[PDB]
Each structure stands twice: as structure tokens, then as C-alpha cells.
Amino acid sequence: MREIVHIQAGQCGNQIGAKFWEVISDEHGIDPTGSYHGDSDLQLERINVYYNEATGNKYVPRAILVDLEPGTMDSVRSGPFGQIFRPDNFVFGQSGAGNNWAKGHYTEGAELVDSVLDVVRKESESCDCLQGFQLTHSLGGGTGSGMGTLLISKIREEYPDRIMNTFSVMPSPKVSDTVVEPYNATLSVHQLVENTDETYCIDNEALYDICFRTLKLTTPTYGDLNHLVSATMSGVTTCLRFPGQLNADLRKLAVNMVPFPRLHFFMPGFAPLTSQQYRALTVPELTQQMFDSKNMMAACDPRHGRYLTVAAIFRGRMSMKEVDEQMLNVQNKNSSYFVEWIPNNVKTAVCDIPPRGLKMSATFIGNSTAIQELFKRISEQFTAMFRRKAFLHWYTGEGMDEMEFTEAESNMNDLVSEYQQYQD
Amino acid sequence: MRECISIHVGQAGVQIGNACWELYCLEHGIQPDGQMPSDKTIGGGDDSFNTFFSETGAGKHVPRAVFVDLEPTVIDEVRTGTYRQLFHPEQLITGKEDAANNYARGHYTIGKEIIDLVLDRIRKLADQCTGLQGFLVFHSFGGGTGSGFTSLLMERLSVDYGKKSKLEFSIYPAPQVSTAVVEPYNSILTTHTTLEHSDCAFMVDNEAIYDICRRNLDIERPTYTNLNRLISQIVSSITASLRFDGALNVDLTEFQTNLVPYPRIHFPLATYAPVISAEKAYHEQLSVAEITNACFEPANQMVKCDPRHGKYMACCLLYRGDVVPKDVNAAIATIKTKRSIQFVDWCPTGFKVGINYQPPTVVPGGDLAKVQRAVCMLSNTTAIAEAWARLDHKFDLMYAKRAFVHWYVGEGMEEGEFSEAREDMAALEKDYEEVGV
Amino acid sequence: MYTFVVRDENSSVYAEVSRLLLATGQWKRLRKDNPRFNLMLGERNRLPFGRLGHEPGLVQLVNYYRGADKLCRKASLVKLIKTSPELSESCTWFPESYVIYPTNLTDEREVFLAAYNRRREGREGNVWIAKSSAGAGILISSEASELLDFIDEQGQVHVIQKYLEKPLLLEPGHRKFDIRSWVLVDHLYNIYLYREGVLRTSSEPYNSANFQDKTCHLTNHCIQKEYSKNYGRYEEGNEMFFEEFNQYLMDALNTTLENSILLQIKHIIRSCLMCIEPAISTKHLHYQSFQLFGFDFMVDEELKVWLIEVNGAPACAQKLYAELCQGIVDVAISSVFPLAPTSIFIKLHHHH
Amino acid sequence: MEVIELNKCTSGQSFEVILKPPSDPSLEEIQKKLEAAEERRKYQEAELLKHLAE
Numbered sequence A: 001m002r003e004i005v006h007i008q009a010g011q012c013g014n015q016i017g018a019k020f021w022e023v024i025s026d027e028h029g030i031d032p033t034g035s036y037h038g039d040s041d042l043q044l045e046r047i048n049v050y051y052n053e054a055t056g057n058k059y060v061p062r063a064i065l066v067d068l069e070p071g072t073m074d075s076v077r078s079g080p081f082g083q084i085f086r087p088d089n090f091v092f093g094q095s096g097a098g099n100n101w102a103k104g105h106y107t108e109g110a111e112l113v114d115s116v117l118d119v120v121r122k123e124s125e126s127c128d129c130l131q132g133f134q135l136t137h138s139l140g141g142g143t144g145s146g147m148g149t150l151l152i153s154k155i156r157e158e159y160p161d162r163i164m165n166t167f168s169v170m171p172s173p174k175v176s177d178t179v180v181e182p183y184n185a186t187l188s189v190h191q192l193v194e195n196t197d198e199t200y201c202i203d204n205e206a207l208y209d210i211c212f213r214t215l216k217l218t219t220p221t222y223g224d225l226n227h228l229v230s231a232t233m234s235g236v237t238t239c240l241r242f243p244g245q246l247n248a249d250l251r252k253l254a255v256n257m258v259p260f261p262r263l264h265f266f267m268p269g270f271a272p273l274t275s276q277q278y279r280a281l282t283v284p285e286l287t288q289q290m291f292d293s294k295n296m297m298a299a300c301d302p303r304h305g306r307y308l309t310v311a312a313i314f315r316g317r318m319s320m321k322e323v324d325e326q327m328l329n330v331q332n333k334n335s336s337y338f339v340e341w342i343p344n345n346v347k348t349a350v351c352d353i354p355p356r357g358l359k360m361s362a363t364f365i366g367n368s369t370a371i372q373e374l375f376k377r378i379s380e381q382f383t384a385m386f387r388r389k390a391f392l393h394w395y396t397g398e399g400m401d402e403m404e405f406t407e408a409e410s411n412m413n414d415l416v417s418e419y420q421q422y423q424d
Numbered sequence B: 001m002r003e004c005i006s007i008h009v010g011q012a013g014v015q016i017g018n019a020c021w022e023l024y025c026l027e028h029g030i031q032p033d034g035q036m037p038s039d040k041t042i043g044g045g046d047d048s049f050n051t052f053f054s055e056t057g058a059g060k061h062v063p064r065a066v067f068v069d070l071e072p073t074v075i076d077e078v079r080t081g082t083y084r085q086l087f088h089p090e091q092l093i094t095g096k097e098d099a100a101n102n103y104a105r106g107h108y109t110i111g112k113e114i115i116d117l118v119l120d121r122i123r124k125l126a127d128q129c130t131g132l133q134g135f136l137v138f139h140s141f142g143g144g145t146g147s148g149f150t151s152l153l154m155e156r157l158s159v160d161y162g163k164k165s166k167l168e169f170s171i172y173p174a175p176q177v178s179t180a181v182v183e184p185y186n187s188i189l190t191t192h193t194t195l196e197h198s199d200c201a202f203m204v205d206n207e208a209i210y211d212i213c214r215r216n217l218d219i220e221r222p223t224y225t226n227l228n229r230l231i232s233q234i235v236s237s238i239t240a241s242l243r244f245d246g247a248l249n250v251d252l253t254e255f256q257t258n259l260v261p262y263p264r265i266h267f268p269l270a271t272y273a274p275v276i277s278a279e280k281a282y283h284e285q286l287s288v289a290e291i292t293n294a295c296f297e298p299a300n301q302m303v304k305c306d307p308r309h310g311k312y313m314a315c316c317l318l319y320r321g322d323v324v325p326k327d328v329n330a331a332i333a334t335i336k337t338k339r340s341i342q343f344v345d346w347c348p349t350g351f352k353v354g355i356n357y358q359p360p361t362v363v364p365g366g367d368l369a370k371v372q373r374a375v376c377m378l379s380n381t382t383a384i385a386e387a388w389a390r391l392d393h394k395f396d397l398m399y400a401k402r403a404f405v406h407w408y409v410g411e412g413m414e415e416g417e418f419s420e421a422r423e424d425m426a427a428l429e430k431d432y433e434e435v436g437v
Numbered sequence C: 001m002y003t004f005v006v007r008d009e010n011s012s013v014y015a016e017v018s019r020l021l022l023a024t025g026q027w028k029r030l031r032k033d034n035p036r037f038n039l040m041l042g043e044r045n046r047l048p049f050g051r052l053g054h055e056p057g058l059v060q061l062v063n064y065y066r067g068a069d070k071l072c073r074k075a076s077l078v079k080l081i082k083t084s085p086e087l088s089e090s091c092t093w094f095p096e097s098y099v100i101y102p103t104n105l106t107d108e109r110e111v112f113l114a115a116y117n118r119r120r121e122g123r124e125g126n127v128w129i130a131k132s133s134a135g136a137g138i139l140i141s142s143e144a145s146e147l148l149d150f151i152d153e154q155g156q157v158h159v160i161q162k163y164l165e166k167p168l169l170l171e172p173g174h175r176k177f178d179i180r181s182w183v184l185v186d187h188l189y190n191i192y193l194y195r196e197g198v199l200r201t202s203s204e205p206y207n208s209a210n211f212q213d214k215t216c217h218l219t220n221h222c223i224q225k226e227y228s229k230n231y232g233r234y235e236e237g238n239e240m241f242f243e244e245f246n247q248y249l250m251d252a253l254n255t256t257l258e259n260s261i262l263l264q265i266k267h268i269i270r271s272c273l274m275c276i277e278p279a280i281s282t283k284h285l286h287y288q289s290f291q292l293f294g295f296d297f298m299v300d301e302e303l304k305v306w307l308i309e310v311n312g313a314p315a316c317a318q319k320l321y322a323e324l325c326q327g328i329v330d331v332a333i334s335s336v337f338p339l340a341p342t343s344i345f346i347k348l349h350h351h352h
Numbered sequence D: 001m002e003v004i005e006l007n008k009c010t011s012g013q014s015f016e017v018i019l020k021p022p023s024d025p026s027l028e029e030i031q032k033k034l035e036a037a038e039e040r041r042k043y044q045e046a047e048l049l050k051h052l053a054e
Ligand SMILES: Nc1nc2c(ncn2[C@@H]2O[C@H](COP(=O)(O)OP(=O)(O)OP(=O)(O)O)[C@@H](O)[C@H]2O)c(=O)[nH]1
Pocket: B009, B010, B011, B012, B013, B015, B016, B070, B071, B098, B099, B100, B101, B102, B106, B140, B141, B142, B143, B144, B145, B146, B147, B171, B172, B173, B174, B177, B178, B179, B183, B206, B224, B227, B228, B231
């Protein structure tokens, strides 16, 4: 057994995390009460990666729910699968973070972080061989962003040789709660550059454009965006939840995907995205969409940069020969967007169990230098306010100095430069 | 009678080893429970097959094999599989977490912590040997365990068994079935530290096995099972002389004598024929001349290259089935006049021939058709240097940017070992050029 | 959409093939180090054949035959002819030749002298020529002493072969010449002779009593345009094409180019290429090869054709680039990578 | 074309056909390698912990 400990922090983190356990619990035949009721042994093959087994053949997710206010987690507890979570794994305060990175990271968050670690330690001790950690959170708020990155820093201090993986929702003005999101995201990105091995960049702008333009949803809600996130998180973790040789565990994934330590921010993609919904999707169609920018969750044009590494996962009963053919047809027909100094940097994996309500699907995981576009948007919105010191008093009032912002600014601009040099 | 200990390291080594011992049992009439009816000496004896099997008082024939993997899911297949009874627990060694396709992680980090346990289990087998010949080590180039731990194991074996021969069966990385971008790093790293410790190594390119499986067996997308059953036939052809009565390659020392005049150039090219689909209606049995001529077709080699543009240093023909020396010499003569077979001026232009009358055994329900005769040619061509060139080139592309190097340094390996290993391969490529050009 | 790379920037022939491929809008050129290519227009020296055919799902094709240098190297050609049974030492269309290594380094010094002394004793014409692959450095002499001493002054392998003292001289002009033929060998090893050839004629009258002035003896397009004073007089650029050369043979000799010369040329091309076919064929290989060869022939006054050399990286006559390069794309590339006549080639059939 | 060293048994035979005549680190040194790598790993982790402690 090689266990993954899941952590979800803040409003976004807990809402997206809730849907994730909802979706994979269905795939593994687990019902809202933790009782297995599937019809295939492949469902229990890697079940212990994400689930603990209790008395009575009960499967309890190895999940830790964290927040600085009780609102969202109360929803999860009363949510569809809310009963399945270990009641001892809910850790929450009462003050909230006020969408303030400094509060999550230095004041309100600091007061709660040790109680989260106690639960993390309790979950780790019951692990045969802990693979590492995955964290769901947004970067534009205070709890998931500020306390989320504080947790990672302290998890790394205590488990320096475990893999740290995150699903990080980047803020966008098109789907914004407060104007300080660029501040919170830029402070967080520097934390992730240092202390995570893999970060799936989930851009709310891309999630919006997909819902509006592709899915034809007039007014997307957070629930609509989360449906895309739930599906994407299920795809990228398929290789971890079912048997296979390619990217089977977190460390092997990191070895194949990360050529340089700081460039570990991935663009995920999913297919199909259908709004004419019963039609069977052919392998050529899965491959074309999966590589199409309109299917990218990071709101970046891959044609503006180059792929360092690519991982693809195909789910369902399909022509494995026709998969290799189409995958090799995308590379040989667009090799100008794949770096030529990493041979055979496009890996493909196949899983028989498809997602709920789909004959077959394809999940895309790209380490593209085009991701620098995302960090450029954040940097520009950050500088536009920081040059006038706008809204800084919310942060100086929590003990922060302007110097820490200046260094976050430089750090993310260095990151953009490092991406630019490998694109040339 | 002198014993041979087989060592299977990593997933590739363990799964290939599992397929070989399946075939060995079928070839020697050994049953899954370990009982060998045709063996009349119960719980003892020094027959030819006893080089690979020991015997218990209860008449069980136990492989002289050690399985080593840093992660247990593969070796658990053996513990609960068809031939679970053949082995005892002390032979199957597994760890908790693997080398993550990281040579440094398997050689240094994890290797340092399990090496002494592995030598101990091997010593238990050596203590049962009245005259140990040496070891057969199955492993991949690309895996972190296959590459990393194997090279450490080969260093210690040279220390604890300085006078014993060591032969390798090594799986060369092929992107069509590969699972790691860094396998070129691991391949060169392990070849460098293992070179001076291996006497004879048989490289099998998964690309070659893959195409043979698609072209000759009509498997559209071959699996590891399809690959390993074909690979085990070739391995069986190579080790048959150790397990059956004969006079050619009857001990591990004879492999180096007959195939390796220059110690660093110890990578013989293997070619096998025929490979016939089991689903075929009914194939016309190829003759000694036809299967022999097939040993010079690039499509049947274990490594894709062009021997026409190299030079031979040695050449062994290992026939199994209905073959007589008269028909072999006839075919050989016919081939010299039709093929470009250039030997080195300092090596006699000759062929060593071995014939085992028992035709190739095929696993029931496998993909290979039963044939009346087959051959495996072992030839030391400079043409196999093409495989080193390809691999070295991929290494150069990534290392020029230091891509993925931090994973190795992070495990304690110094960056200089990269260039040290790559410079050794450069010298190896120069040695091939000096001999065949 | 097919992809190709370019690794020989100095090739005029394949510069036009590269330009033509792009014109079809169905071929895309990649950087010279991108391994994911359908076609390689490779370098002349040390082309990395060992790296071709190992990209999954890519049918790869190169414009050179590994091993074809055995035919396109001065000394290699002599060794191939004398040692191959298909050609034998009695090969009647190749001038008597010997491989001679400079003394500052097998070698055929003594065997050449034996044949030389025989001619000198027999009153026969005993003029020879010394050349090598490291030339623009050629020496024509009738004394064996000067020939051997000229090779020792150098440092590379040389070949001494009989000099055709009775060349066929075009009139008016009383001038030597040689014939260049372009031969394309595709991936299936079909041998295609370009219907168009060229005679690289000498503009200076042939003078048998003075091998010191090498302007009327060497018909190279460079020596005639540099040291020759009548360049471009009779024909534009010392290049006569088959239509003119044929009419001449009818007016002067009452024969045709086909019967008197082309039959022997086609025979020589087949013999040479069919000889090395088992050594260089890519029929059952992981990659495929084609290659364009330049065959150079001499014609004596008896209308007998002689083989002078074979070029593995030949240039083309300016007037024939367009038609020929289009022919390469048609039968050599697009035959393997089809696109979404009256052929310009003469297929030389043979047994495989 | 000469055959030599012919040997025959019940299970097969072998021979040779000539077509033409011709023309380590000690156990101690291994422990040092493994311990030097482990030392660099320990050193690198101490630098990370020092960084986190700051
Ligand atoms: N022919 C064949 N190749 C295999 C097999 N298993 C793995 N490989 C190849 O081996 C390489 C990967 O090495 P593995 O043996 O799987 O890795 P490992 O030795 O277990 O080391 P780690 O997993 O990193 O700890 C890839 O190139 C695979 O294609 C097998 O059963 N047969």
C-alpha cells in the first residue's frame, strides 16, 4: 500500500475537494456511507491510495478538511457524501481569513496550523508507505492561499522526503471575489515554486470561458466550474487509483514530468466537453480536443510556448492501437511545439474503467512553457496595484512589510524568465 | 556438475525471470508443485538440469533463483501465481517503495539499505553449491531498480565472488513500451558502473521484440506477457547448453571465451528464428538453411542494427530440434556466398555450432507456434554499437540542458558521475570503431 | 503533412528538392536536429544511419545508401571490381587500374610495374594517369617513375589506371569529352536512368604529344572554364546534350546514341548497382534509402564505352535541375509519401 | 571448410566449422561511495531544514 493523504483548505479548496471525493467515491463503488457496492475488482485494486478501511468493510477517505471559518465545511458535512468523512478530520476556526493571505499565513492561520498537523500526523502514522500529499485550494483567498501554503511549508519540514502535490485554482478578474486576489496569488505562487513537486494550475478564467463559450452556459456558477475541476481531478489521478506502469505513483509522475525543480506547474485538460451528448466520441476526436487550447484549464495558448513533457490518460474500452496512432499523429504533425532536447517526452496511459456517464474520455497533463502567460497576467495585475501601494494596508496591518511584496514580485518575474529561456 | 544462480532485479527482471522458469519447468518436465517424475534420484543427483534446480528430500526441484524488487506488487505475482510452490519465501525479496525510475535512488538511497539483505539470500544459495559457476542477472536499463540496484549488486558480487562469472540479460529501453523519459540517463549510468563487472551481456531491445510480436505473431499491441514469452524462448536457447548434456557453452566461462575476445566489447547480438504465430492455419516448417539464413535478416535480431556494416569477432549457432551437422554446414556455405560476413583480421572466420535435439518447447496457450527446428545465433558484431550511439545521443540532448539532473543529485549522486559515465560510453563507442572500421 | 530535415546545405540538387517539397504545401521543413522526420536530406560524410528507423510511427527515408561509398571512392571502386565475382578482374568496360599507397604509410605497386614493363617491352602505348579522391591533383605520364614519385609526394591513397589514348574526338575541334549520367535508385532498388545526360567536352584540340598541358585531356567543367581559352565556343559552357550529340553521331558516324553508346552505359550501371545490392539494399531494414548517382563514362574511337568513376553526391547541369529534381520527388519521395508522363526516367529492369 | 571438435551425446552434438584462418573496488571503497552519497543527502536536507527554520 502506497497511501496519499488529501488536504483541502478554504472555501474553494473544500468545495472542489468535496466534489472530488464525490466523483471518485462513485468510480470506486463507494456509497455516501462508506460501504462498497461496486461490481468490479479493479475498483478495490488501489482503493487504499485514497481510502482507509475501517470496521465492517467501511472505506473512510484519507482526507483532512481545513478552514478558518465553519461555513463551507458545514455544507460539506451536510452535503451528498458528507457522512463519509472522518469527523475527527474536520479542523476549523471561527475568525475567518477575510480573503487575506497574511491572515491565513501569519496570524489567524498560524493559530490553527498545529491542530491540522496533528491530524496529518495521525493519518500518516496509519500509512504502510506514505507516497505524499495532495492539497486542493485557491490562491486568491486567504485560507486556502495563505494557510494552505503555510501547511505545505510545515508538512515539508516534517516530511522532507515525501511528494507534495497541489490542485491550485488561480484567480481571474472574470470570476473574482476581491481585488486583492493578485496579491494573494503572487504571494502563494512563490510558496509553491519552493515547496511543491507538482501543481495542477486550474485557472478560473479558463473554466469560465469553457462554460460560457464551449459548454454554452449563459451564467456559469461556481458549481458549474467545479464540475470541470472534479472531472479533471479524476482524470489526472486515474493512474494513481488503478493499476498501471506509467506515472503510477506521485514520485514517478514527478520524475517524468519535471525536468527542472521550479518548473513544476502543469496545464491540465479534459475531453470530451459536450453541451448531441449521446454520440460516441472516436479516438481521433478525443486526441484532437484533448490537445486543443479550448480544452485547457489554464487559460494559456500552448501554441505560444513549448511542451517540456506531456502525460495523457485514456479511459474506457477503446483501440489501444488506434490510441498510439493518434497520439503519434499529434506529435509528428506539430513537433514544433515539443522541445527536441527531451526525447519521447509524450507518454500515454490507458485505463479500462471510464468516468461515470461516458464511454471513453481523455485527460491531458502538460508541462508547457506557455504557462508563463498565466504568471504574466497575475504579475501585471499585481504590479498595477502595488506600484500605487493600493490595498496594502490590509497586509501591513497584519505584520507584513512592503519588502515581502517586492520579493514576491521579483520571484514570480524570475519564474517567468526561467520559463522564457527554455522556450528558446 | 556446477551450479548457476539466477538473479532477477526490478520489474523487467522479475517478470522475465518468471517466464523463463515457467519454460524451464516445461522443458525439464517439472510440474508447478516442483515434482519432476522423470527424475529417478530423489532428493539428490548431479544431472545437467541440476545446475539450475536443487532438490529437497521430498523430491521438490527448487530454482536456484533470487528475485529482488524494491516494490512488492510484481514479486507478489510470483508468491501467488502458478509456480508459487517452486520457490520458498527466502528467495523473493521485496521492499516498500521503488526507485521511481531514478538510478541514483536505486543504487545509492535504497540500494545501500537492502544490499546486505540481498547478498545474504544469495549466500544461502551459494552454500548449497558444490561448485558455483557464477550468476545470471536479469534487469532493465531504464528502471531505477533495474539500473541502480543492479550495478551496486554487480560490484558487491565481484567482491564476494571474485572468481565467478557474471552474465547479464539486459532490456534496452524502447519508447513504444517505455514509462520514463530518463531511461537514457539510467541506461548509460548503469552500463558505466557495470561494464568492468560483467563478463557477457545479452542486450534485448524492447523495440525489436515489439515489432517481432506485431509482425510475426500478429499481436496488434503486444503486452509484457507477449514480450516476456518471446524473450524467454531466446534466453532458454542461450542457457539450454548449461541445463542439458552437451559440449558447447557448458559453463559460464565458455561464453566469454567463445564470444568476447575484448573484455569491454562483451555485448553479443542475438538473432532468433523462426517466430511463427500460434493462430496461423498451419505454417510450412522452415528448413535448416532457411532458419539459418533468417539469422542474418535484421528483422529477427534482438537489437535492430545492420551487421552488414560491422565486423564479427565471434559467432555461435545454437540449434534446437531436427537438425544434423550435414545440413548446418550446407546452409552455412550457402550463406557465406550470399551474405556480407566480414570478420576482424585477428579472429578466425569460423562458427561454433550446437545442436539440442529437443525442439523448442512452447507454453500451452502462448502465442508461439510449435516448430520442428529453431536456431539462435549469438554473434559479436561491431554493428551493435549503433544501439550505443542512439542511446548516447538521447543522453546528450537532455544532459546539455541538465534536464532531470536534479532528481539524481537530490539522491546523493554527484553531477560528475554523469559526465564520467558518458565519457566511458564515448570510449566504448571508440573501441567499437577501432575494431570494425 | 509530411516532415523533412536538411543536413547538407551545399547540395544544389536537394536545395531544389527542398524548395519543390514546400511548393506542394504538403511537406514541412524542420530543424536539422529534429528526429521526428519522414525524410532526411543528409550530409555527405558520417551520416548517422544508426539513428534512423527508431521513431515509433514514423516511416523514415534518407537520400543516401549506407555502403554506397564502396562504389563512389576511387580506390574502393577498383577493389570492388577486382574482387567481386560479378565484375571479375577481366571486366572489359573498366580501364586497367591499381591501388597505390604512398610509401610514407593491400598495395599493388609491384603488380602495376609488371603490367607496365610488359607494355613498354611490347611497343604498346604505355600512358597512365594518377588520381585520388583528395583532388580538386592529377598527373598524366608515360614514365612509371614520374607516376610513383608523384603519389609519394602526397599522403593519401592514389589509383593509377590506363589512360585512354584513343578517345572519340568530336569534329570540328578534334576535342576530347566525357559523358555524365544521372541514376536514381529508389527504396525498392529500382534503377532509374535519367533520360537526359550531358557531355562535358574539352574546348581544346586533343594533343597526344603533350600530357603536360592538362586542358585538352581533362574535361572537367571547372578545368575547361578556368585554364581553357576556347571555353563556350562550340557549345554553351562545354556542355553538349543528348539531342545534339545524337544527331552528330548520325551525321558523322551513321549510328545513334542508343545503339553505339547507351546500351553499354545501361549495362555498366546495372552491373555496378546489382553487384552491391545485397550489401546496401534496405528492403528488409527499419529505414529506407534512395540515392542519386553520377556515372562518368569515356568513349574511345571504336565506340566502346568505359567507366571512369561514380559520384555519390553529384551536381546537375543547370538546364536539367528542374526536370530532374521534380523526378526525384516523383519516384523517390512521393512514391513512399504520396500526395493528396511520359516518365523522365529509363527503368533498368533486373533480377533482385 | 573444415569441421573440428565434434562431440555427440544422446541429447545433441556440437562442433566448430572453420572457413578461413586468421591473419575492482574493494568492499571498503564501495562503502565510502555509498556513505558519501548519503552524506550529501543529509547535507542537502539540513540546508532545507535551515531554510525552513529561517
Ligand atoms: N521486455 C520487458 N520490458 C519491461 C518489462 N517490465 C518493464 N520493462 C521495461 O523496463 C523499463 C522500466 O524498468 P522497470 O524494470 O519497470 O523498473 P524497475 O527495475 O522496477 O525500477 P523502479 O520501478 O524504478 O523501482 C521500461 O523500458 C520498460 O519498457 C517486462 O516485463 N518485459
